[PDB]
């Protein structure tokens, strides 16, 4: 399949080039990669390299613009406002899943979600508070919870993606050793099981007892059905094992 190409003098005569345009609906496909992929990669690269104890204003650290950028991203992956009519809602779900799985072959498994997790480098948002400028660990919550929710609803999004957090269950454990976002882990679980349980098949006593230690510090999350009763059952459609 990897027929690498080099510009020969004449080469083969039977080497025709048929064309495919990004069609009307694929103007969205053209728009996502320009507006949201390359720019996001550059911005996150600048901030990630700067988070390794580097001089602040010499490379991209635009904290005015990075927060605005991830807010625009969250608006891009927003759900379709359930009160809307049926066909518009389903078209928006189509577009949402397209711009999810189109990040995915670009590297949600490898780079993009790896870029978010790589952007989680924090000892403490208090100890970094008097290091670089005046603000390092302000909006960890937004990036963390929201875009992890985007991934979990992507893994929902195309019905055979249980690829990164279920696949890299070490990166699921990287969530469980921190315990601030118990509002995307359940988005992984209750969509993993209906597809196929991949996440739940190595998690163990050492995870559940940590969650139970957290549970003393809670008032029952109010989607506890999702986290614990999908750790058990998957809402009536289970896998016995």
């Amino acid at each position: 399949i990897q027929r690498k190409a080099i510009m020969h003098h004449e080469g083969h005569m039977d080497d025709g080039l048929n064309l495919s345009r990004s069609q009307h609906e694929e103007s969205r496909t053209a728009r996502v990669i320009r507006s949201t992929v390359f720019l996001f990669n550059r911005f996150i690269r600048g901030l990630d390299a700067l988070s390794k104890k580097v001089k602040l204003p010499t490379i991209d650290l635009p904290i005015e613009s990075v927060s605005l950028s991830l807010q625009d991203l969250i608006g891009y992956f927003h759900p379709p406002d359930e009160h809307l009519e049926h066909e518009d809602k389903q078209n928006r779900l189509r577009a949402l899943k397209n711009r999810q799985n189109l990040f995915q072959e670009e590297g949600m498994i490898n780079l993009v979600l790896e870029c978010i997790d790589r952007l989680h480098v924090y000892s403490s948002a208090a100890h970094f508070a008097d290091v670089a400028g005046r603000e390092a660990g302000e909006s960890w919550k937004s990036i963390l919870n929201s875009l992890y929710e985007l991934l979990a609803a992507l893994i929902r999004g195309n019905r055979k993606n249980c690829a990164q957090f279920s696949g890299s269950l070490d990166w699921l454990i990287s969530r469980l050793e921190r315990l601030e976002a118990s509002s995307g882990i359940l988005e992984v679980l209750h969509c993993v099981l209906v597809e196929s349980p991949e996440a739940l098949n190595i998690i163990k006593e050492g995870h559940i007892k940590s969650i139970i230690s957290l549970l003393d510090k809670h008032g029952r999350n109010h989607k506890v059905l999702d986290v614990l009763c999908s750790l058990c059952v998957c809402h009536g459609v289970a896998v016995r094992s």
């Binding site: 345009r21 069609q23 009307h24 609906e25």
Partner: protein
């Protein structure tokens, strides 16, 4: 007067349905089936021919206005896949059996009843689909199936050429 009353009662029967989105439902289920021969699409085609059944112009313009609004490509992709998924005589299995068709007729009848009454809009919209990004030429897609029938039935003749007479199963498979 018998015939005319039959026609008018048939139109009343069809208007019980096509005033309630039956045609759009038919096009929707055919677009959902992306080239998968099944019974769920066969019953749809039976409903389509049953509502059309005499060149009903109302349901024709309804279907056409729907497709020009939505610009759904899955309808034509589904049809062109369905034709490739349709069957022919299969001489070898008949040789083995010496010791799939109602669907095709209903499909092509549904395709015919859109262009009945010399509807010049549907006749052109099954060639170009000019409003849409992507096009399918259904007309060539049925010519190709005609070739795939002609080759099979000429082979079935050549099997029976040198022989004397024809049995019952061969003549049924012919008809």
């Amino acid at each position: 007067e018998e015939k005319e009353m039959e026609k008018q009662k048939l139109l009343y029967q069809q208007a019980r349905l096509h005033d309630r989105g039956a045609a759009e439902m038919v096009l929707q289920t055919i677009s959902a089936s992306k080239g998968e021969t099944g019974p769920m699409v066969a019953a749809t085609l039976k409903l389509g021919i049953a509502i059309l059944n005499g060149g009903n112009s109302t349901v024709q313009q309804k279907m056409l206005d729907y497709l020009k609004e939505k610009k759904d490509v899955g309808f034509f992709q589904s049809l062109a896949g369905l034709m490739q998924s349709c069957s022919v005589l299969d001489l070898n299995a008949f040789e083995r059996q010496n010791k799939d068709d109602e669907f095709t007729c209903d499909l092509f009848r549904f395709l015919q009843l859109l262009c009945e009454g010399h509807n010049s809009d549907f006749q052109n919209y099954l060639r170009t689909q000019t409003g849409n990004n992507t096009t399918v030429n259904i007309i060539i897609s049925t010519v190709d199936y005609l070739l795939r029938v002609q080759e099979s039935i000429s082979d079935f003749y050549w099997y029976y050429s040198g022989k004397d007479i024809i049995d019952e199963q061969g003549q049924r498979n012919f008809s």
